[PDB]
Amino acid sequence: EQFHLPQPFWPTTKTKEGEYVPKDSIREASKVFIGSGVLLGGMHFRRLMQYKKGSARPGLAKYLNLFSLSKSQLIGFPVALGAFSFLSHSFANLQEGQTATGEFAASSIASLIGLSIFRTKKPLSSNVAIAVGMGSLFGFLTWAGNFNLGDNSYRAALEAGNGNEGGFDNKVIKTERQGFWEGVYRRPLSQTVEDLGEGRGIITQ
Amino acid sequence: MLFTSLLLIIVYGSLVNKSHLLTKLINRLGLIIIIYTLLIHLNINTLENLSIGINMFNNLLLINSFNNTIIELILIICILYVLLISFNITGLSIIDNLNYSKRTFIVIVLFNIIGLTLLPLVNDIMILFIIIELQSYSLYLLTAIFNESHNSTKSALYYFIVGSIASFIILDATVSIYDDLGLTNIQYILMYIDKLEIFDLLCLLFGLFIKIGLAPFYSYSITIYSLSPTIITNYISLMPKLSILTLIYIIMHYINIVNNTDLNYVISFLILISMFIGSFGGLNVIRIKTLLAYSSLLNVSYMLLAILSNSNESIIAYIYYIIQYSLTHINIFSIILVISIYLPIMNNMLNVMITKYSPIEYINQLKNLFINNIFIAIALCISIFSLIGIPPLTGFYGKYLVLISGLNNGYVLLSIVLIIASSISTVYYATILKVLSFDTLSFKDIISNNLIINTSPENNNNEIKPEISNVISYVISSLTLIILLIIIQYENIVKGAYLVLLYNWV
Amino acid sequence: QSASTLTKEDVLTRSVSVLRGFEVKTKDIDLQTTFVQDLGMDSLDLNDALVALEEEFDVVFDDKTANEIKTVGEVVDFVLANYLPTEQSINHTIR
Amino acid sequence: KSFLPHFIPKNYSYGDYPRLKPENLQKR
Amino acid sequence: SSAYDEALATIRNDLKLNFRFKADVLEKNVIRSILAETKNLEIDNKDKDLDEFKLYDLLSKMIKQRQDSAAIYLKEGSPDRFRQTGWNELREVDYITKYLEALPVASAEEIEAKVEPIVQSVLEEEGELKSPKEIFSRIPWKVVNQDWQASEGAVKNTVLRLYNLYKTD
Amino acid sequence: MLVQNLIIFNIIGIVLLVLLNNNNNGILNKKSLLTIKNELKLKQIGLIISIINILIIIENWIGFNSNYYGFQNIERFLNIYWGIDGISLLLVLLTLILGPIAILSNWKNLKGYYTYYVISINMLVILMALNFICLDLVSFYILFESTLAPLFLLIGIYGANNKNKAAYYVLIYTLASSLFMLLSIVIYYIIINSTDYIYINNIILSINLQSLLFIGIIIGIAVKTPLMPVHTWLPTVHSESPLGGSILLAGVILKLAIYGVIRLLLPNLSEISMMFTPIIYIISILTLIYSSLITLKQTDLKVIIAYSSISHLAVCMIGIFANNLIGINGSLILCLAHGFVSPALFILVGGILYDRYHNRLINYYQGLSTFMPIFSIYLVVFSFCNTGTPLSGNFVGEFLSITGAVIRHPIIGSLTAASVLLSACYQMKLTNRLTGSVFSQYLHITNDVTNREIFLLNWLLIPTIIIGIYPSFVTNILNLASSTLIYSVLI
Numbered sequence A: 001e002q003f004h005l006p007q008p009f010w011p012t013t014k015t016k017e018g019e020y021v022p023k024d025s026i027r028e029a030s031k032v033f034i035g036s037g038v039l040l041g042g043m044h045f046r047r048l049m050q051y052k053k054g055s056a057r058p059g060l061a062k063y064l065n066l067f068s069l070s071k072s073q074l075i076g077f078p079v080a081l082g083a084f085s086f087l088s089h090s091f092a093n094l095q096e097g098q099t100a101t102g103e104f105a106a107s108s109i110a111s112l113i114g115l116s117i118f119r120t121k122k123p124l125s126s127n128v129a130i131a132v133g134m135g136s137l138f139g140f141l142t143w144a145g146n147f148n149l150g151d152n153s154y155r156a157a158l159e160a161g162n163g164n165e166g167g168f169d170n171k172v173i174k175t176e177r178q179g180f181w182e183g184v185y186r187r188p189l190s191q192t193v194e195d196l197g198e199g200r201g202i203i204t205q
Numbered sequence B: 001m002l003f004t005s006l007l008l009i010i011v012y013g014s015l016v017n018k019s020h021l022l023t024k025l026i027n028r029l030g031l032i033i034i035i036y037t038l039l040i041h042l043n044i045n046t047l048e049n050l051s052i053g054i055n056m057f058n059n060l061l062l063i064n065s066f067n068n069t070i071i072e073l074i075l076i077i078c079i080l081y082v083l084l085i086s087f088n089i090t091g092l093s094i095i096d097n098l099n100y101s102k103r104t105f106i107v108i109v110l111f112n113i114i115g116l117t118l119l120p121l122v123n124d125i126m127i128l129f130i131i132i133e134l135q136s137y138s139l140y141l142l143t144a145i146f147n148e149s150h151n152s153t154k155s156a157l158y159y160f161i162v163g164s165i166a167s168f169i170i171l172d173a174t175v176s177i178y179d180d181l182g183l184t185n186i187q188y189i190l191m192y193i194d195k196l197e198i199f200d201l202l203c204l205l206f207g208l209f210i211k212i213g214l215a216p217f218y219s220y221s222i223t224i225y226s227l228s229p230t231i232i233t234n235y236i237s238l239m240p241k242l243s244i245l246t247l248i249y250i251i252m253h254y255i256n257i258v259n260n261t262d263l264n265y266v267i268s269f270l271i272l273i274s275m276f277i278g279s280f281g282g283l284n285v286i287r288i289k290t291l292l293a294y295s296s297l298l299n300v301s302y303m304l305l306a307i308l309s310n311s312n313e314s315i316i317a318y319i320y321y322i323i324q325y326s327l328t329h330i331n332i333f334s335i336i337l338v339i340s341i342y343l344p345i346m347n348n349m350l351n352v353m354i355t356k357y358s359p360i361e362y363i364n365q366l367k368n369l370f371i372n373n374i375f376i377a378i379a380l381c382i383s384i385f386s387l388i389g390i391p392p393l394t395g396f397y398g399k400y401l402v403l404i405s406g407l408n409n410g411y412v413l414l415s416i417v418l419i420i421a422s423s424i425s426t427v428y429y430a431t432i433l434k435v436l437s438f439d440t441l442s443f444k445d446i447i448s449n450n451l452i453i454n455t456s457p458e459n460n461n462n463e464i465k466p467e468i469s470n471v472i473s474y475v476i477s478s479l480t481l482i483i484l485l486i487i488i489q490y491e492n493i494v495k496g497a498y499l500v501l502l503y504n505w506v
Numbered sequence C: 001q002s003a004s005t006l007t008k009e010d011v012l013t014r015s016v017s018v019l020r021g022f023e024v025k026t027k028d029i030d031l032q033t034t035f036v037q038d039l040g041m042d043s044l045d046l047n048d049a050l051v052a053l054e055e056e057f058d059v060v061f062d063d064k065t066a067n068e069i070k071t072v073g074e075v076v077d078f079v080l081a082n083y084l085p086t087e088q089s090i091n092h093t094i095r
Numbered sequence D: 001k002s003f004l005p006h007f008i009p010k011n012y013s014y015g016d017y018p019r020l021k022p023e024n025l026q027k028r
Numbered sequence E: 001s002s003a004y005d006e007a008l009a010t011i012r013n014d015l016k017l018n019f020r021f022k023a024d025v026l027e028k029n030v031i032r033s034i035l036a037e038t039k040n041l042e043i044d045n046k047d048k049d050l051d052e053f054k055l056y057d058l059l060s061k062m063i064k065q066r067q068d069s070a071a072i073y074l075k076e077g078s079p080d081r082f083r084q085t086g087w088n089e090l091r092e093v094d095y096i097t098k099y100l101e102a103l104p105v106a107s108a109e110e111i112e113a114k115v116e117p118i119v120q121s122v123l124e125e126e127g128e129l130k131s132p133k134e135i136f137s138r139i140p141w142k143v144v145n146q147d148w149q150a151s152e153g154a155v156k157n158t159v160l161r162l163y164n165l166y167k168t169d
Numbered sequence F: 001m002l003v004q005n006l007i008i009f010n011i012i013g014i015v016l017l018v019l020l021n022n023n024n025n026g027i028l029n030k031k032s033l034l035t036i037k038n039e040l041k042l043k044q045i046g047l048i049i050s051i052i053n054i055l056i057i058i059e060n061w062i063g064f065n066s067n068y069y070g071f072q073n074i075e076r077f078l079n080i081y082w083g084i085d086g087i088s089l090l091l092v093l094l095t096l097i098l099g100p101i102a103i104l105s106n107w108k109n110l111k112g113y114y115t116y117y118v119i120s121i122n123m124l125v126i127l128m129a130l131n132f133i134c135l136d137l138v139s140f141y142i143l144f145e146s147t148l149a150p151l152f153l154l155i156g157i158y159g160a161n162n163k164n165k166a167a168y169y170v171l172i173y174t175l176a177s178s179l180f181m182l183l184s185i186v187i188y189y190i191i192i193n194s195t196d197y198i199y200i201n202n203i204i205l206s207i208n209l210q211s212l213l214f215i216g217i218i219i220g221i222a223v224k225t226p227l228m229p230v231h232t233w234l235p236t237v238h239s240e241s242p243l244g245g246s247i248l249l250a251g252v253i254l255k256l257a258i259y260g261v262i263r264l265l266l267p268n269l270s271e272i273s274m275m276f277t278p279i280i281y282i283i284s285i286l287t288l289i290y291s292s293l294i295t296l297k298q299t300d301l302k303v304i305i306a307y308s309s310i311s312h313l314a315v316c317m318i319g320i321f322a323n324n325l326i327g328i329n330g331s332l333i334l335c336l337a338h339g340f341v342s343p344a345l346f347i348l349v350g351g352i353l354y355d356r357y358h359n360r361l362i363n364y365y366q367g368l369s370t371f372m373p374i375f376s377i378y379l380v381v382f383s384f385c386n387t388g389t390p391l392s393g394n395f396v397g398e399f400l401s402i403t404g405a406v407i408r409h410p411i412i413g414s415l416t417a418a419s420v421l422l423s424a425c426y427q428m429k430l431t432n433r434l435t436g437s438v439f440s441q442y443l444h445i446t447n448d449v450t451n452r453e454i455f456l457l458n459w460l461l462i463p464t465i466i467i468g469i470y471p472s473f474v475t476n477i478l479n480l481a482s483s484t485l486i487y488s489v490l491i
């Protein structure tokens, strides 16, 4: 029998089997890669014009140096963003949806690919340390439900009757599991055995 | 009352001769004007009558119980600020004469108060543009009131340029909406809320975000608040936020009708970045006003989460938070102005230069405050602990009420990030307290006759001479005890915030 | 911006090169190197060097110091203590 | 003849802390 | 002299970039100062070829000179009004160290990884350590350019640093 | 009556000390009369206030019914409901008894500012004591975090050389972790509209939501016990904080985490607590084993005792997460027994040796029994109490906690018995060295234990042995309160 571990995951809408038309990973990555390279390269040559227009003004030169990108960053940034978009969509197609593990893998690999290009003069272990840190941040971003839970929020649940507006009643027992945001007075004992299993005080000793 | 009394003060100030006493007495007349303005406004505007929302002046303005509360808060905080220029902050002429040397100081404040109070009431795009200019222009004139100061003028130049770019963005957003619909009144535009481009209103919010110093536009406000005189920085860092944030809440109330989640994501991106910059930005700084500038950026991010969620729990969160944060802001700047009297005097490395506009400029000028004035040092500790969010101070309930509204709307990420942001910013909040007190025992038995306060004379050597003036001491005592003992009346105060409605009704 | 970026090694290095272009007895110049003895400058040669060292560092020796200067190190000390960048227009800094 | 106990590093690097050959004082 | 000529090309290139993009003024002073000492270096070592190790000792002297100047100023104060002379010395040390660490020579850890077995083996065969002069003897100061890839002076610093750690008196 | 009197009386005490000691600040430059003998009168008033606080809880103890199920003395004050049960009553009395001890331990070893220290001690004691009598989650959090403000300033003003490091550690480790516990409290108030203990105890939440709420709360609890790997703040804070700060930190502050499990986890998140127990046991067992082996290599006297506290509080965590009465009672008795022995060991190590020699390095001390025989008796006696030698309350707490773990999980709960061996390894390695060999060459002969330090040691030893021999004084009070925490459906 499987281990009964806690599952601390925020509610998400689950697509029915047969749903989830996949997204073209190469096509979507192409738009991010090309659009980023055009902007970053275009903004690079726009700033060179600002350099030529003025180089004896320290105020302009200081601000231009902050926004200046090295040659390896002008290539590495579009590649890292393109690989991110490709791998994020490729893993999402694999898993019939987007998961925090998929985003952690996509972000760390995309970071490591970019870091190995525009951070060549640093130890390899240093680039991996940043890539693990970068990948964890985006995995945490997906785990928290991106920028908002949306239809899975409690306010949304409360508007759909899936909250606790009506209160509780012990006489009512439901075979189906309660909603994520719903609380009940009494539960079927079969649900407890499904969650915890038998053993240390459930049913048997 | 404001408009009528401003005209008399404008003319009267130009008639009488120029002296420091006359300017100080004219400032006290400004204090009476705001008090009468508050009494008249309270006598006619009541929360129960304004719940529906009442149109005025051919529907150009719309006042409701949510707008009315902010107007009274603006008047009350403006009363506390005028006490700074209407009474002695330190009692020493070398420091206090600055507040009495500009006769147009009180006139500009009355000009700006009119703009501050009318801005949340705007009900038309034409009057929205006019009022946001009226508020902005007065802020520029106040930032440049000390025109013989190089830093004060440089700040006003930066303020004018950035605030004009934001105003053009605001104007460009309203012109786009008028082009789409051919309508100017907000309530008329609400009839077409489902057909106009909603991101035309995000452009309107973007111009408002610049004027409150939100990231990524935070750079200019951090620069301006640090370069301006402490008396100027006290006003300009707080007053624009009271009105603009209230207006942002009303605009976001209309935006939520169509429920555009793409717009919610862009704003969440700006809040997320501002939490990161507000917390990590203040870790390596040596100026107190630069530190407080990042504190302001951080607390605005907290309020914008309540504004973004925009629900019944958000009205209570925003209303309570804005009131308690204004009092904490007023209390901290009052203490910083006072404690310049404990500054040592030379009789040198790093060639540190301190000016008359900002005698307290570095965090380590707060050293040994626990020894010089224990009651004031504790008052500053209570305020800083409130910014940290230590219960049961007012700052704790502010973060608690913000989290409730944010988590109720599914903003899991922003609720976690702000709590991490609170922990990170605690590092530089604690550094203030470390400077105030941590060297008390290793310095208790030292001879410090080189302070600024020691330059003052003594009357008779048989009288008791208070070291701090009466009015400024009572204000610090009152605000500190309100921050400390809010637990006594928290239940009654939050029940009042339940009644403040923004078209809830039923 | 309006602060010096001078080091003692750069000022000495620039001083030596400017002094090398003159007709001096020795090209081996250090801080202790005197003008009259080691380099061999009369009244007029010394003041030609001082003005030449003025133009290089954009500094102006005061009359009291210039008349009483003996060594190369004294010049390096003077430049480090008195050098200020020239004020720029109202647009160079803020823009 | 006499040998050091186990788990005694042959080198270490702790900044400016003096570096010395490990001497088991029990054998003095 | 292939590495020396390649190294001096990057220093010249950074000078061209600095004038082009108006980079930090102090960096312009550093590169200009390096080139002048290189100009002196070429005169006194003609026909002898210029390995990067002889360039390494040139930048080492510049780094050590400014650190000594920085130490005095950061203790008794900088002479300029803005008190930036002491920090300017250390800022230049960073610029010089950037080029020093780009030369194809051994790092501090590689040189210490070869002298530390020698310092320890001296002390165990003799008991007490008094002067570094007993450690210079067991150093092959003839072939430390391709087996160790270090200059004559960088080994001297490594021994002196290690000696002060291991000295018993 | 209890909460209202305990707050009103102490505010009057706080205001009284401020009025007397601050009436002469105004360039009087006088010599006063209360400043004599290191502010003796102001110290004595604060000492009296601490004892009176113990009298207040007694008046409510006389009317306590050990055969009543539910909270008693239910009161409303400041719009908050306050109540007491068997578990809360004992923790309140433990908290208040340590109040006079904290003041008396620092009776004459402060460089100055005695009025500030006494107020902060009495302020810390009341806030911690009030944390056991609140009846909602928000009131629990308010009192949980309110202690950070005085504790942060207490360390930074009266602390040792590295006080700045220790003040930041306690403020940031505890505040950041508790904010995660605040997130769970906010969720409760959102979906249930109340944080009342009784109201939330009856609601069953979805098994996924119970997991998220458990993790939020356990983060705040795990840092404050502390457990591995978030324990690194405690050894730094204990070695630099003043003696009274170490006593309150080692006697009360750590026990709030166990009470957090009793209130915030067991009765409301009952289903998910059973799921998390193996994870809790693994973390706690490794906390016990790792802290014991790490304690061997320590060289600071006050840090050795700090790591000893972590090992025993891992055993308290193991017992409280046993789903039986034996483990729960054993964990509670071990909390009280630790609440006396651990402060005593800090007095011996950081209050007697440090006040004479001002050095906490282990290498300076040996053979102390030659010229400090009275110190050696108390050091040896408390060392055996600290290792759970029978006749001590520590053993009764440890044996029942280990037994409760074995009953809960026979396989992995048996590893808890390593507390018997490992605790004696590091504690008797330190004691065997302080009392062994010739009197140290680095020390000069000085006075032995004084009357004040004898008094402190005796009145921390006496409760430990009374509980050790007749724990039914405590188990009778806890019996009906502890039985409500058990979750099981036997068919």
Ligand SMILES: CCCCCCCCCCCCCCCCCC(=O)OC[C@H](COP(=O)(O)OCCN)OC(=O)CCCCCCCCCCCCCCCCC
Residues within 6 Å of the ligand: A031, A032, A034, A035, A036, A038, A039, A081, B216
């Ligand atoms: C004749 C040619 C005319 C060319 C006109 C454009 C001028 C050159 C500019 C380069 C192109 C970038 C802008 C493209 C339009 C703006 C983005 C957009 O609207 O999406 C278009 C493109 C395709 O997406 P699509 O699905 O077809 O559009 C929706 C259809 N229902 O979506 C994309 O994938 C565009 C690529 C965007 C991703 C790269 C940008 C992110 C990385 C760079 C960030 C730039 C700096 C950050 C700015 C924010 C700072 C706070």
Ligand SMILES: CCCCCCCCCCCCCCCCCC(=O)OC[C@H](COP(=O)(O)OCCN)OC(=O)CCCCCCCCCCCCCCCCC
Residues within 6 Å of the ligand: A043, A065, A066, A067, A068, A069, A137, A138, A141, B215, B216, B272, B273, B276, B277
């Ligand atoms: C196309 C032009 C480039 C795009 C610029 C975008 C500007 C707006 C974006 C918002 C950031 C506003 C901050 C101020 C803008 C920074 C201006 C800038 O680009 O300068 C680059 C700056 C200098 O870095 P430096 O490498 O020393 O200079 C280059 C030397 N050649 O390097 C920096 O320090 C920039 C980083 C500033 C800090 C921003 C951090 C925001 C938070 C990001 C993490 C969010 C945290 C949550 C993560 C969890 C979710 C995954």
Ligand SMILES: CCCCCCCCCCCCCCCCCC(=O)OC[C@H](COP(=O)(O)OCCN)OC(=O)CCCCCCCCCCCCCCCCC
Residues within 6 Å of the ligand: F461, F462, F465, F466, F469, F470
């Ligand atoms: C270094 C610190 C200094 C302190 C060191 C010494 C500490 C004091 C030692 C005693 C510890 C206190 C525990 C005794 C307190 C009295 C407990 C008690 O209440 O006993 C009640 C007992 C049964 O109760 P009941 O039948 O209900 O009748 C009484 C109704 N009220 O009724 C009875 O029959 C009373 C019987 C009491 C017997 C005397 C107890 C004294 C201890 C001797 C026995 C200890 C156990 C033996 C251990 C020997 C070694 C293995």
Ligand SMILES: CCCCCCCCCCCC(=O)OC[C@H](COP(=O)(O)OCC[N+](C)(C)C)OC(=O)CCCCCCCCCCC
Residues within 6 Å of the ligand: B374, B375, B378, B381, B382, B385, B390, B391, B392, F010, F011, F014, F018, F021, F022, F025, F113, F114, F115, F116, F117, F119, F120, F123, F146, F149, F150, F153
């Ligand atoms: C139960 C709720 C109580 C709330 C009230 C708190 C006390 C108010 C003290 C004000 C008077 C004062 O600053 O007085 C100062 C007094 C006594 O200092 P002293 O040694 O005489 O000063 C020296 C004078 N000499 C030189 C003449 C001897 O310091 C105290 O009292 C300190 C108590 C507060 C410390 C913790 C601050 C935490 C802030 C956030 C709390 C959540």
